[PDB]
Amino acid sequence: PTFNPPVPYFGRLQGGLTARRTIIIKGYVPPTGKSFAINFKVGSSGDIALHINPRMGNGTVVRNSLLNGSWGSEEKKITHNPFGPGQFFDLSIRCGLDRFKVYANGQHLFDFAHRLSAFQRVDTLEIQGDVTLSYVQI
Ligand SMILES: C[C@@H]1O[C@@H](O[C@H]2[C@H](O[C@H]3[C@H](O)[C@@H](O)[C@H](O)O[C@@H]3CO)O[C@H](CO)[C@H](O)[C@@H]2O)[C@@H](O)[C@H](O)[C@@H]1O
């Protein structure tokens, strides 16, 4: 569903991830959550073009790709962490030609350069772990 979709969320991307296709994810970080993952995948149990993994313990926002069975180099730098315990957030993920552009609460969060060059093969949004979703638009 689009409203209050329960976790784990699996949503098919109609014609694959178009360049300029934006995904909106509104949710809530439970006060006793450890971590949640937003995964843009090549199907079920295939490559993850972008893995976004807020971790409540260290307050990190890890980005990586799982490609050909293996994790790449993590990217961690941010200017703000909107995923604090008990906080609501509004995410905007826009698939660019050369990078994802992610905003949280209207504010730039990070860019993630494409490691999977052919992003259009991304056909599955996956959201997992310790998160409550109010709204997901794909
Ligand atoms: C030990 C391992 O940790 C998790 O899995 C994820 C992985 O953890 C990294 C960790 O962030 C890093 O400090 C260390 O050097 O390597 C670990 C293994 O790759 O990070 C990726 C993204 O890079 C994903 O978040 C993985 O889920 C964890 O849940 C495993 O069960 C395991 O305990």
Swiss-Prot record:
Residues 9-138 form the Galectin domain. A beta-D-galactoside binds at residues 71-77. The modification Phosphoserine is found at residue 73. It comes from the Eukaryota. Monomer. Contains two homologous but distinct carbohydrate-binding domains. Galectin that binds lactose and a related range of sugars. May be involved in the assembly of adherens junctions. This is Galectin-4. It comes from Homo sapiens. The chain holds residues 186 to 323 of 323 of the full protein.
